[PDB]
């Protein structure tokens, strides 16, 4: 005797099977996984009937639907992925300012830091896995999302995790081809050497949190040997977020657009967001806090941006 359920591995084509209910889902398929949770070692039970069944794919036309949702060929993602979302689902995502926001629990003030940055910024992702996901995290349904996040860094639930690595991951996985970042350096002996960067080290600075410093100019060591001060020609692109090691700073309304917030030691500590709305709004899991000026331990904030050029 049998039952009808569906198999896929994108959940866009879904795969009608008939199983064997004396058989496990393992030896008819293979790693076999519902809504997240592992059924690779349970036998088909009876309301399973109808449902839809995530499986890694054996036809190469699997393989190639996979390839082609979540550019990515490596045979552990769907798993670590699967393994995310079991955790992710049960994970509460309350609406915080009209903004998602994650309930804080199995270790993820980071994500939440980064899922509130990227409903802020102007972000098209490559994989229509994550374009998606993100899509319905915007609308509130966010385990999703949180889930191939992980998977995509190579990062579990309970890791703790950086939000300027957790980004670069993300902008690696989005169509920043348009972003370009003129530099120009001036050492008083190697000469004017002018760079150009294009997608990621374009929309990214790690050195100061000021735009406007940026613009200014800050000190380097440069090409020839030693004394040398580089500054932004050019930077065509939606945003870009300037990063530096948890100083403390004071965020004016109406200058940056968002920003996180660093208590506590290297790899040891806890985040909040920071966004400048109506006033300063700081966003910790659920809880909202705003605040006309606000002075604390900041280490990455995002300005938007499209064209500036320099005199
Ligand atoms: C939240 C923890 C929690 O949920 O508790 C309620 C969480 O996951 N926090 N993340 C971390 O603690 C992990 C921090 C981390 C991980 C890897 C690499 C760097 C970092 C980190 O500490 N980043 C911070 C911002 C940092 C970056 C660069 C320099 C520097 C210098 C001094 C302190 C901190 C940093
Ligand atoms: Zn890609
Ligand atoms: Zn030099
Ligand atoms: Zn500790």
């Known amino acids: 005797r049998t039952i009808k ?7 866009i084509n ?30 088909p039970h009876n309301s399973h009937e109808g ?20 550019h990515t060929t490596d045979p552990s993602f769907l798993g670590r992925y699967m393994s995310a979302l079991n955790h992710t689902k049960k994970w509460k995502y309350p609406q915080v300012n009209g903004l998602t926001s994650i309930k804080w629990a ?23 896995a994550l374009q998606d996901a993100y899509y319905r995290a915007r609308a509130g349904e966010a385990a999703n999302f949180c889930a191939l996040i992980l998977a995509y860094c190579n990062k579990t639930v309970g890791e703790l995790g950086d939000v300027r690595e957790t980004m670069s991951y993300l902008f690696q996985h989005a169509n920043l081809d348009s972003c ?6 001036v ?3 190697c000469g004017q050497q002018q760079t150009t ?51 403390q700073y004071e965020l004016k309304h109406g200058t940056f657009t968002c920003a996180s917030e660093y208590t506590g030691n290297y790899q040891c500590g806890h985040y909040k967001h920071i966004t400048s709305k109506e006033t300063l ?17 900041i280490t990455d904030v995002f300005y938007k941006e499209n064209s500036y050029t320099t005199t």
């Open 5 to 11: 359920v569906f198999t896929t591995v994108d959940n």
């Open 14 to 43: 879904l795969h009608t099977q008939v199983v064997d209910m004396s058989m496990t889902y393992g030896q008819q398929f293979g790693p076999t996984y519902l809504d997240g949770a592992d059924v690779t070692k349970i036998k």
């Open 51 to 70: 449902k839809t069944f995530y499986v890694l794919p054996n036809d190469d036309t699997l393989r190639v639907e996979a390839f082609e949702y979540y």
């Open 106 to 128: 199995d270790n993820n003030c980071y994500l939440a830091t980064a899922l509130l940055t990227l409903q802020q910024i102007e972000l098209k992702f490559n994989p229509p």
């Open 180 to 185: 370009k970042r003129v530099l120009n350096v």
């Open 187 to 189: 050492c008083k002996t």
């Open 197 to 247: 960067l294009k997608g990621v080290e374009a929309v990214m600075y790690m050195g100061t949190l000021s735009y406007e410093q940026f613009k200014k100019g800050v000190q380097i060591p440069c090409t020839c040997g030693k004394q040398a001060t580089k500054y932004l020609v050019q930077q065509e692109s939606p945003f870009v977020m300037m990063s530096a090691p948890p100083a």
């Open 281 to 297: 709004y700081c966003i910790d899991g659920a809880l909202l806090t705003k605040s006309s000026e606000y002075k604390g331990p």
